């Protein structure tokens, strides 16, 4: 259901698409998870649900402060 994307955000390339959705930040996969009400979270922000996997990707880029995700 969620729409795919691919953009540069704060110097890093965020992008994701349906696999049931996969997200990657600068080539590395950022494990995300969808809740019952369609909201989303990620390994980098697991208790703060956001509307989309794009929002979830941007939350991470922010919190990561330039730090790359581990495989």
């Amino acid at each position: 259901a969620p729409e795919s994307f691919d953009e540069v955000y704060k110097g890093r390339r965020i992008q994701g698409r349906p696999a049931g959705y996969e997200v990657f930040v600068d080539g590395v996969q950022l494990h995300v998870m969808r809740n019952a009400d369609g909201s989303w979270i990620s390994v980098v922000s697991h208790y703060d649900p956001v509307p989309t996997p794009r929002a979830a990707a941007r939350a991470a880029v922010d919190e990561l402060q330039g730090a790359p995700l581990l495989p």
Binding site: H31, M33, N35, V43, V44, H46, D48, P49, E63, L69
Partner: protein, 275 residues
């Protein structure tokens, strides 16, 4: 063995608590815990098998998990007990808990790195090995991501819920558990994790010692609810697929059932309760 309010701890008690935890870190026992929690938090789904979170067994599971941790501490110093953090009453950064002689304070703006207390990365006593990103230091941002922590009023609002949990027994559920957990309603448990920041807000939250104090209070809350609703108890009562029923054994132990953890008094008691 009594779990005291972190606000009531003496300098002595804090010295033995902090020392007990650093040993666990030094021996490698501490990281095992961070690795276990991450396992379930990353595997638990609303649509599928859920044991540690977004499910009725979120409470009994963390109760046993904390039991494991406290016992590991007691194996370093048998006088150390896990203290709770009533974040409702102790809401600011000027709380004993965040003093350099306990957990330390928030992290610096530049990178969110904790700079004081026994768990600062500069002490060499607290490296972050179980990470999600390249950073190896403890990070925090008390009150940075979210306005405030829940209030006494709010907590009472949840404790007031008579239904322990209710189908679909997940993060969309109504009832006590899910509200305590936070996915719905005023939001308690999740927000605290969001309010601390750093690693607490990520899938490797136990990296922050505050994790245990926090969950020791969520644990005390279930106990206070139980007291409020004697006529109400754990559910589902059996047959629920993907969900842990009253008499099923949860992972990773496969030897403990939510029914074996309803009465905490078999393992410990609190300094004081409620109403």
């Amino acid at each position: 063995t009594v779990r005291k309010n972190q606000a009531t701890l003496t300098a002595d008690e804090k010295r033995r608590f902090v020392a007990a935890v650093l040993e666990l870190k030094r021996s490698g026992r501490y990281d095992e815990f961070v690795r276990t929690h991450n396992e379930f938090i990353m595997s638990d789904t609303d649509s599928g098998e859920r044991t540690g979170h977004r499910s009725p067994s979120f409470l009994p599971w963390h109760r046993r998990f904390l039991l494991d941790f406290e016992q590991a501490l007691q194996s370093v110093d048998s006088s150390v007990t896990l203290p709770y953090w009533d974040w409702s009453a102790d809401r600011t950064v000027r709380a004993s808990l965040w003093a350099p002689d306990f957990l330390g304070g928030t992290g610096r703006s530049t990178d969110g790195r904790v700079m004081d207390g026994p768990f600062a990365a500069s002490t060499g006593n607290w490296p972050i090995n179980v990470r999600v990103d390249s950073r190896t230091y403890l990070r925090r941002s008390l009150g940075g991501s979210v306005a405030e922590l829940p209030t006494r009023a709010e907590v009472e609002s949840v404790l007031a819920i008579s239904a322990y949990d209710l189908p679909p027994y997940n993060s969309a559920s109504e009832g006590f558990r899910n509200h305590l957990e936070g996915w719905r309603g005023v939001n308690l448990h999740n927000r605290v994790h969001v309010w601390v920041g750093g690693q607490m807000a990520t899938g490797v939250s136990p990296n922050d010692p505050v994790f245990w104090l926090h969950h020791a209070y969520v644990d005390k809350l279930w106990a206070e609810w139980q007291r409020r609703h004697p006529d109400s108890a754990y559910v589902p009562t059996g047959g629920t697929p993907d969900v842990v029923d009253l008499n099923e054994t949860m992972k990773p132990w496969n030897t403990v059932r939510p029914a074996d953890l309803l009465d905490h008094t078999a393992y410990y008691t609190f300094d004081a309760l409620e109403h």
